[PDB]
Design a protein around this motif. Structure first.
Motif, PDB file in Angstrom:
ATOM      1  N   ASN A 125       0.843  -1.187   0.000  1.00 20.19           N
ATOM      2  CA  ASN A 125       0.000   0.000   0.000  1.00 20.19           C
ATOM      3  C   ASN A 125       0.880   1.240   0.000  1.00 20.19           C
ATOM      4  O   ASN A 125       1.991   1.229   0.536  1.00 20.19           O
ATOM      5  CB  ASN A 125      -0.947   0.019   1.205  1.00 20.19           C
ATOM      6  CG  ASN A 125      -0.207   0.112   2.525  1.00 20.19           C
ATOM      7  OD1 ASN A 125       0.899  -0.409   2.669  1.00 20.19           O
ATOM      8  ND2 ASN A 125      -0.816   0.781   3.498  1.00 20.19           N
ATOM      9  N   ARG A 126       0.367   2.307  -0.607  1.00 25.18           N
ATOM     10  CA  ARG A 126       1.051   3.587  -0.637  1.00 25.18           C
ATOM     11  C   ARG A 126       0.586   4.447   0.537  1.00 25.18           C
ATOM     12  O   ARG A 126      -0.285   4.059   1.319  1.00 25.18           O
ATOM     13  CB  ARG A 126       0.807   4.288  -1.974  1.00 25.18           C
ATOM     14  CG  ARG A 126       1.950   5.176  -2.436  1.00 25.18           C
ATOM     15  CD  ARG A 126       1.501   6.116  -3.540  1.00 25.18           C
ATOM     16  NE  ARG A 126       2.533   7.089  -3.885  1.00 25.18           N
ATOM     17  CZ  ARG A 126       2.335   8.138  -4.676  1.00 25.18           C
ATOM     18  NH1 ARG A 126       1.139   8.353  -5.207  1.00 25.18           N
ATOM     19  NH2 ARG A 126       3.331   8.973  -4.936  1.00 25.18           N
ATOM     20  N   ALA A 127       1.178   5.640   0.667  1.00 21.93           N
ATOM     21  CA  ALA A 127       0.772   6.534   1.751  1.00 21.93           C
ATOM     22  C   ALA A 127      -0.637   7.080   1.545  1.00 21.93           C
ATOM     23  O   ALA A 127      -1.463   6.953   2.467  1.00 21.93           O
ATOM     24  CB  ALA A 127       1.806   7.651   1.924  1.00 21.93           C
ATOM     25  N   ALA A 177       1.184   6.014  -8.647  1.00 25.99           N
ATOM     26  CA  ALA A 177       2.473   6.378  -8.077  1.00 25.99           C
ATOM     27  C   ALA A 177       3.546   6.304  -9.152  1.00 25.99           C
ATOM     28  O   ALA A 177       3.589   5.343  -9.927  1.00 25.99           O
ATOM     29  CB  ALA A 177       2.837   5.460  -6.906  1.00 25.99           C
ATOM     30  N   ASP A 178       4.403   7.317  -9.196  1.00 27.58           N
ATOM     31  CA  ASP A 178       5.532   7.355 -10.111  1.00 27.58           C
ATOM     32  C   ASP A 178       6.820   7.017  -9.370  1.00 27.58           C
ATOM     33  O   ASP A 178       6.877   7.017  -8.138  1.00 27.58           O
ATOM     34  CB  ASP A 178       5.648   8.731 -10.774  1.00 27.58           C
ATOM     35  CG  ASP A 178       5.446   9.869  -9.795  1.00 27.58           C
ATOM     36  OD1 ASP A 178       5.051   9.600  -8.641  1.00 27.58           O
ATOM     37  OD2 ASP A 178       5.683  11.034 -10.178  1.00 27.58           O
ATOM     38  N   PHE A 179       7.862   6.722 -10.143  1.00 30.42           N
ATOM     39  CA  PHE A 179       9.157   6.318  -9.596  1.00 30.42           C
ATOM     40  C   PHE A 179      10.041   7.556  -9.491  1.00 30.42           C
ATOM     41  O   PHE A 179      10.842   7.851 -10.377  1.00 30.42           O
ATOM     42  CB  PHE A 179       9.795   5.236 -10.458  1.00 30.42           C
ATOM     43  CG  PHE A 179       9.036   3.941 -10.458  1.00 30.42           C
ATOM     44  CD1 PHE A 179       9.193   3.033  -9.425  1.00 30.42           C
ATOM     45  CD2 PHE A 179       8.163   3.635 -11.486  1.00 30.42           C
ATOM     46  CE1 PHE A 179       8.495   1.842  -9.419  1.00 30.42           C
ATOM     47  CE2 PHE A 179       7.463   2.444 -11.487  1.00 30.42           C
ATOM     48  CZ  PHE A 179       7.629   1.547 -10.452  1.00 30.42           C
ATOM     49  N   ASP A 180       9.887   8.288  -8.385  1.00 31.22           N
ATOM     50  CA  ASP A 180      10.716   9.456  -8.126  1.00 31.22           C
ATOM     51  C   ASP A 180      11.171   9.531  -6.673  1.00 31.22           C
ATOM     52  O   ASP A 180      11.678  10.579  -6.254  1.00 31.22           O
ATOM     53  CB  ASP A 180       9.971  10.744  -8.504  1.00 31.22           C
ATOM     54  CG  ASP A 180       8.826  11.054  -7.560  1.00 31.22           C
ATOM     55  OD1 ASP A 180       9.058  11.734  -6.539  1.00 31.22           O
ATOM     56  OD2 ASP A 180       7.690  10.616  -7.838  1.00 31.22           O
ATOM     57  N   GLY A 181      11.013   8.461  -5.898  1.00 32.49           N
ATOM     58  CA  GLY A 181      11.384   8.474  -4.497  1.00 32.49           C
ATOM     59  C   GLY A 181      10.223   8.141  -3.584  1.00 32.49           C
ATOM     60  O   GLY A 181      10.243   8.472  -2.395  1.00 32.49           O
ATOM     61  N   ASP A 182       9.203   7.487  -4.132  1.00 32.84           N
ATOM     62  CA  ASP A 182       8.032   7.116  -3.354  1.00 32.84           C
ATOM     63  C   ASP A 182       8.313   5.872  -2.518  1.00 32.84           C
ATOM     64  O   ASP A 182       9.132   5.023  -2.881  1.00 32.84           O
ATOM     65  CB  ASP A 182       6.834   6.868  -4.271  1.00 32.84           C
ATOM     66  CG  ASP A 182       6.426   8.107  -5.042  1.00 32.84           C
ATOM     67  OD1 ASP A 182       7.101   9.148  -4.899  1.00 32.84           O
ATOM     68  OD2 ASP A 182       5.430   8.042  -5.791  1.00 32.84           O
ATOM     69  N   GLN A 183       7.620   5.772  -1.388  1.00 33.24           N
ATOM     70  CA  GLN A 183       7.772   4.660  -0.464  1.00 33.24           C
ATOM     71  C   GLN A 183       6.437   3.951  -0.288  1.00 33.24           C
ATOM     72  O   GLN A 183       5.397   4.596  -0.121  1.00 33.24           O
ATOM     73  CB  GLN A 183       8.293   5.137   0.896  1.00 33.24           C
ATOM     74  CG  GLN A 183       9.527   6.020   0.811  1.00 33.24           C
ATOM     75  CD  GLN A 183       9.930   6.584   2.158  1.00 33.24           C
ATOM     76  OE1 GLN A 183      10.688   7.550   2.238  1.00 33.24           O
ATOM     77  NE2 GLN A 183       9.423   5.982   3.227  1.00 33.24           N
TER      78      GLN A 183
HETATM   79 MG   LIG Z   1       5.804  10.308  -6.391  1.00 36.35          MG
END
Ligand SMILES: [Mg+2]
Ligand SMILES: [Zn+2]
Ligand SMILES: [Zn+2]
Lengths: 65, 70, 49, 138, 145, 50, 84, 202, 144, 85, 212, 225
Positions: free
Chosen positions: H72-74, H107-113
């Motif tokens: 899951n994302r934030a 969600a994109d790949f730029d530093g997401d957790q």
């Molecule tokens: Mg992002």
């Protein structure tokens, strides 16, 4: 329409706490745990989804036979 | 010889009684009480219970009968 | 009594790399030299945007 | 608002008509009645003929079947005009879910309907003489 | 693979770790060399005063500064007392609360700075720090003259 | 949406994975790149501004 | 939860290893250390009712201690690495 | 941890670092070592997972084969934000995610957790595989349009593959079946898009 | 400048593939671009934990053990699990996995034994609310 | 299990049934030693013991007796979870 | 100079003409080098036999059909490319076929010599409600009709569809190693398993002269 | 049907050297060209400085007195050396110089089996107030290996004395192949390979093709057996 909740544990989340507990005290309404938001604070199973078979057997074996 | 989780859901068309049927069946295989009809393919007890639902070899009557016997 | 440690954190898949024009990026893998595209001269590229 | 009953047994629903505003249509009847049960028996635009004798659910096959005939006004059972108590019947609800079959008995349709509206919220922000575009009768 | 082998984006991080010496009514805390329930491999990189040598490669979970805390009224259980007599382990009444590096943080100590108070005794490790500072401030001033 | 409706779910997941495999393999063969010559400026743009 | 399970699993194994080690030597270690619920006693108090001597109860203690030392080594407890 | 795109993963499985799987499935390793016979007590099994021996990795992969973990994302604005995947032991310090499933997480790949979750009860493992699996929620709950659609990178390679050209290399020839088109193209004698005629068995 | 350095005029040259070995049928834009490295490495963000220390009043996991830190399971993830047919999953992440005393200890023994019994237990977030309500002069009981 | 959580008034005759002792002294812990005192806000007689299976004065500390009252100090030996109930 | 030598644990054979092999233990950059080197030999230049020339009675154009046949003239040339003909006596011979009966025309009715051998005899050619003159030869690479009236494409390669997928393999010693998964599809003239041993022999003979 | 015999090695420089094996058959020219390119870059025998021990410094971060360049820059210059080991697998080298003179690769003491290719490669700048002295240790490896992977030869006592380096030896840098045409008066489909090899000088380009032939034959032999 959200202020017409019969339960007090689900009404004390967004509304004032001292306003719901005061009305529930002077009235003495014995509230059950029917619904979805009630079992989250208590910690019991949720009737929505796979938990419908659990609450069905609990209500069947309760003063019914 | 592969996992079939979509074909078994169309038989009951509920996706909720299948979880309750696979739960009572998986506990009989993890505790060593009963023997599975389908052979073992180096799988765990949770995924092997869903293989018997799609094949129609087990239902709500076989699980209830496997508890009274010993 | 205080101490001071020296850690050399080399680059690894997962770090954040970006340029001066505002293009963030998380590195995926470290491909070998033989897999990088090369021109007719034989100079393999490093970053593939 | 969790589904607790399979079917009520009443016939109370609102009429469904495509968007006929402007010059051309916006949403046809195949998209507004996609995955919904029929309330009453739909009649053929002819003299006296019935198409759905029982008024069951409409799948992807019955959508193109309505394009053959010239039917335009159909009634469907909506959850806003149900008859159950403290819940929503499974027959009155549609079939638009992650699966392709009908709804189940126990699925929380009240939460999945509120999240579907609040999710795209972050993407939100003379006529003196009229004329016709498509030739036809009045 | 040419950006990693050439050591291009390999930076250097300097992380510090400070240890304190609290004063309690049960007993004062001092930096000692002996640590209860350790071996020779744990005290191999440590000196006779309790400070890690300058430049010693430490791993995740090593002892850097030897800090012991005295305590009383341990009230040990009979199950633990049975094991203290089998392996020949002495009943140490001082709890070990030394400083250790966290998991996943490994490097090389570049320098160690100590601090003492007025009226407190110093160890042999602090004598080598003031001697290197006095020799540096004397060799450089004699060379610039 | 049409493959899942007339075939099923078991053959749709395998089809969605093979469609992604053939989409990434053929995207690397065609070295599409954006440059300064791709932004074709119309020659009649200066006529409208003037 | 991990620390509360190690103390419970070790207590169920210490009492189990004493019942399977020996018969005459098991009652001597239980009398010196109350691991089975008994009260702790000194060497003179335990020897006055069993053995009738002060050195006979200590000779069996060292013999049973060396036997349990070899059991924990071959079982995989690795006491040389825990105490270091 | 930081997410990372992986084009070599299936739609039902994802990636997971080796150092994270040892901390999440820690109680599951102690139960497998005692039943196998390598670890006698639970205290001796704790020193085996912290020593990083060569036999702890073979027993670790036994519980990762069939164990749907949650992702899951934030920000969670819909039901597709929490999906269950099958973890695969990968080397690194990042979560290897599927490229097609990124459209649902938004969600994109730029530093997401993205946080992880491990269900313990077998009752939770069955309802996570039949309901929370990434292969089951292939359709969006809003409308009938599927949420698993080829993204910008996948649609670019498919658009160039299906294109019309006036003149090309190998135009005007015929083929026996689909097996002859793949052989003539990879041999370097036929273009990627040329007007030909084939007979198929549909 | 590309004409002086013996470079193509358009700046796009076709490159050969490294794995297959064939030539791409399209010019590719190559060159040198300045890149940076941000201080967002994975060594300061990747962490995981199973057991740890808990607080005094509320039995919730926290740091201090120098191992890792537990993440927050907010209300946004509660509505997502209720959207599915999940009943035992959400009940597990609220009673057994957190806010318990006897439930966490008894569940850890079930994982080592090999059978998941899934004891019911009682959440500690509600037992504290009962003691705080009864101390205010307002009565609360369980009729069952 | 339990169900039908109700809310009523706290009767004066019912409050005495929930409590186990009367708090009369405001002091909680001694100055020299870190031990609670009787009839205090943190007393062991009213609420419960501090440690697991141990009284205040330390007379009864064995793990055999589950429930017993010491003759020196009127405290019932129990676990550490009883102090919250 | 130690390396990981692969060993075939199993050969997944799903059909008599379609096979699938797997090589688990490999090096880092060798999982794709051996796959692409073996794919170019089997697909591009593989020794075989096929039809090189096809002439019939009334070959006007490609779109001009012939009367008396229910099938089009384009489908006749498409059915001859899939025919499996294998000869070893002479390098280049000329076959013939004369069918006067109606109903159906099969490939088993073709008159073969002592050297011409046909693998598939049940493959249909055209439906009759005709006399042609075809010629076969030995070719090495897949040559189209544009290279070098009568003209048609030829396919001398026994295999039809060759592909390979490189995926990682979990090794107890190395944490990052990939495996090779090859699959073939022939027309039945050669064993799909034996075809891999023939391609590896050709690549080995071109390097043994400069090895010791 | 055709096999390469008596290849030609056209050495145009010490680093860059081109080779034309033989006019091969059509189809196998471009196949063997791309196959041999990935072999020369994957695994090739090479030698480099594995570790360096200085008796005047504790760790690599602190600088020393008398040397202009930093110690980290000194260890980064040792990676560019090209040391050839003929017979011995692991040898220990020394280096010592005192005075106002720059140190190069030729300052290392000569050996009967150690031959350094480059001699103009500088290491560090010295002065009159300081001097340097260290011991070098090289080894023979196959591919790239970091300092954290080859954890061996340690006794928990050489931490403050010995300093390890990053082994990144690679004798081959650039490989380029083209497909030319040749005449043999036997067939029309003939083509040869022109491999543009770029070796740093550690190995001879003639032995590079022979060492790349026995490794490919060992990988293809698994299909026969
Ligand atoms: Mg992002
Ligand atoms: Zn209704
Ligand atoms: Zn007392």
């Amino acid at each position: 329409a959200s202020l017409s909740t019969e339960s007090f544990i689900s009404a004390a989340s967004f509304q004032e706490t001292t306003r719901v507990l005061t009305e529930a005290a002077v009235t003495g309404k014995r509230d059950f745990l029917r619904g979805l938001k009630e079992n989250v604070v208590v910690g019991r199973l949720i009737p929505a989804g796979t938990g419908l078979a659990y609450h069905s057997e609990r209500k069947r074996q309760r003063d019914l036979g | 010889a592969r996992v079939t989780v979509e074909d078994c859901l169309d038989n009951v068309d509920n996706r909720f009684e299948l979880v309750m049927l696979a739960t009572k069946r998986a506990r009989q295989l993890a505790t060593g009480g009963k023997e599975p009809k389908v052979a073992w393919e180096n799988d765990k007890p949770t995924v092997v219970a869903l293989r018997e639902i799609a094949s129609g070899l087990v239902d709500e009557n076989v699980v209830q009968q496997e508890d009274i016997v010993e | 009594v205080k101490v001071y440690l020296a850690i050399k954190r080399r680059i690894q898949p997962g770090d954040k790399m970006a340029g001066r024009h505002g293009n963030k990026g998380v590195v995926s893998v470290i491909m070998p030299v033989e897999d990088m595209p090369h021109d007719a001269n034989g100079t393999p590229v490093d970053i593939v945007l | 608002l969790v589904v607790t009953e399979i079917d009520c047994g009443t016939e109370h629903g609102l009429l469904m008509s495509p968007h006929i505003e402007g010059g051309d249509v916006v949403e046809p009847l195949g998209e507004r009645v996609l995955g919904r049960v029929i309330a009453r028996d739909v009649f053929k635009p002819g003299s006296d003929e019935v198409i759905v004798p029982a008024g069951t659910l409409i799948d992807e096959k019955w959508v193109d079947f309505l394009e053959v005939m010239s039917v335009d006004e159909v009634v469907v059972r909506s959850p806003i005009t149900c008859e159950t108590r403290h819940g929503i019947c499974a027959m009155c609800y549609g079939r638009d879910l992650a699966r392709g079959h009908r709804v189940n008995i126990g699925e929380a349709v009240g939460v999945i309907a509120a999240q579907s509206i609040g999710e795209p919220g972050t993407q939100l922000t003379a006529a003196d003489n009229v004329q016709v575009k498509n030739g036809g009768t009045i | 693979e040419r950006v990693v082998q050439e050591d291009r984006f390999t930076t250097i991080h300097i992380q510090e770790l400070t240890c304190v010496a609290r004063d309690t009514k049960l007993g004062p805390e001092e930096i000692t060399a002996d640590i209860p329930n350790v071996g020779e491999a744990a005290l191999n990189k440590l000196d006779e005063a309790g400070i890690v040598y300058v430049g010693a490669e430490v791993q995740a979970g090593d002892i850097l500064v030897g800090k012991v805390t005295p305590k009383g009224e341990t009230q040990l259980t009979p199950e633990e007392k049975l094991l203290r007599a089998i392996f020949g382990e002495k009943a140490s009444d001082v709890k070990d609360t030394s400083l250790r590096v966290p998991t996943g943080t490994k490097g090389t100590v570049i320098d160690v700075q100590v601090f003492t108070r007025d009226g407190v005794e110093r160890d042999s490790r602090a004598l080598s720090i003031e001697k290197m500072q006095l020799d540096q401030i004397r060799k450089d001033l004699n060379e610039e003259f | 949406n049409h493959c899942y409706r007339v075939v099923g779910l078991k053959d749709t997941v395998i089809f969605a994975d093979q469609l992604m495999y053939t989409g990434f393999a053929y995207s690397t063969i065609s070295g599409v790149s954006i440059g300064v010559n791709d932004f074709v400026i119309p020659d009649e743009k200066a006529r409208i501004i003037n | 939860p991990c620390e509360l399970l190690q103390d419970d699993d070790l207590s169920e194994s210490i009492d189990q290893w004493l019942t399977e080690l020996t018969d005459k030597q098991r009652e001597v270690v239980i009398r010196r250390f109350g691991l089975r619920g008994h009260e702790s006693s000194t060497l003179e108090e335990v020897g006055q009712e069993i053995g009738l001597t002060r050195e006979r109860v200590r000779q069996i203690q060292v013999e049973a201690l060396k036997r349990l030392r070899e059991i924990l080594e071959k079982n995989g407890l690795s006491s040389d690495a825990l105490f270091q | 941890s930081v997410i990372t795109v992986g084009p070599t993963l299936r739609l039902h499985q994802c990636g997971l670092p080796k150092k994270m799987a040892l901390e999440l499935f820690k109680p599951f390793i102690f139960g497998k070592l005692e039943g196998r016979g390598m670890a006698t007590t639970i205290k001796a099994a704790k020193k085996m997972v912290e020593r990083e021996l060569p036999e702890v990795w073979d027993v670790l992969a036994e519980v990762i084969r069939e164990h749907p973990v949650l992702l899951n994302r934030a920000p969670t604005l819909h039901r597709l934000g929490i999906q269950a995947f099958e973890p695969v032991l990968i080397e690194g310090k990042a979560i290897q995610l599927h490229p097609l499933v990124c459209a649902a997480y938004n969600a994109d790949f730029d530093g997401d957790q993205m946080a992880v979750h491990v269900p313990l009860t077998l009752e939770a493992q069955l309802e996570a595989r039949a309901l929370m699996m990434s292969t089951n929620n292939i359709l969006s709950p809003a409308n009938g349009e599927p949420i698993i659609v080829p993204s910008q990178d996948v649609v670019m390679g498919l658009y160039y593959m299906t294109r019309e050209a006036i003149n090309a290399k190998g135009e005007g020839m015929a083929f026996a079946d689909l097996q002859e088109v793949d052989r003539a193209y990879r041999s370097g004698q036929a273009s990627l898009h040329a007007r030909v005629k084939v007979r198929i068995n549909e | 400048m590309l004409k002086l350095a013996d470079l193509p005029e358009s700046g796009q040259m076709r490159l050969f593939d490294g794995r297959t070995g064939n030539q791409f049928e399209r010019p590719t834009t190559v060159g040198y671009m300045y890149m940076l490295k941000l201080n967002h490495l994975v060594d300061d963000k990747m962490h995981a934990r199973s057991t740890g220390s808990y607080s005094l009043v509320t039995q919730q996991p926290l740091g201090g053990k120098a191992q890792f830190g537990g993440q927050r399971f907010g209300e946004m993830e509660v509505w997502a699990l209720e959207a599915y047919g999940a009943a035992y999953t959400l009940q597990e992440m609220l009673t057994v996995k957190s806010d318990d005393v006897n439930g966490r200890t008894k569940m850890y023994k079930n994982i080592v034994d090999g059978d998941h019994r899934m004891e019911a237990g009682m959440p500690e977030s509600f037992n504290v609310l009962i003691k705080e309500i009864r101390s205010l002069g307002i009565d609360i009981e369980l009729e069952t | 299990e339990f169900d039908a959580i109700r809310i009523g008034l706290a009767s004066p005759e019912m409050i005495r049934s929930w409590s186990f002792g009367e708090v009369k002294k405001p002091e909680t812990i001694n100055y020299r030693t870190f031990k609670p005192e009787r009839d205090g806000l943190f007393c062991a007689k009213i609420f419960g013991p501090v440690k697991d299976y141990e009284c205040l004065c330390g007379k009864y500390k064995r793990l055999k007796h589950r429930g017993v009252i010491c003759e020196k100090c009127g405290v019932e030996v129990a676990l550490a979870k009883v102090r919250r109930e | 100079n130690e390396f990981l030598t692969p060993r075939h644990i199993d050969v997944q054979v799903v059909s008599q003409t379609r096979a699938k092999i797997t090589l688990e233990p490999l090096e880092r950059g060798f999982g794709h080098t051996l796959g692409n080197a073996l794919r170019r030999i089997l697909l591009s230049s593989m020794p075989g036999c096929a039809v090189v020339e096809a002439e019939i009675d009334g070959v006007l154009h490609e779109y001009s059909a012939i009367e008396g046949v229910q099938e089009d003239v384009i489908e006749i040339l498409l059915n001859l490319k899939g025919l499996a003909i294998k000869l070893h006596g002479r390098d280049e011979v000329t076959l013939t076929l004369a069918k006067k009966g109606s109903g159906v025309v099969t490939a088993a009715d073709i008159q073969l010599d002592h050297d011409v051998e046909i693998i598939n005899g049940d493959h249909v050619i055209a439906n009759l409600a005709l006399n042609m003159k075809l010629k076969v030869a030995r070719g090495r690479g897949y040559e189209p009709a544009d290279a070098r009236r009568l003209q048609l494409d030829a396919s001398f390669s026994p295999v039809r569809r060759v592909s390979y997928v490189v995926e990682n393999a979990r090794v107890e010693q190395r944490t990052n190693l990939d495996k090779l998964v090859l699959d073939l599809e022939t027309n039945g003239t050669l064993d799909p398993e034996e075809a891999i041993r023939r391609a590896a022999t050709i690549l080995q003979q071109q390097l043994a002269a400069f090895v010791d």
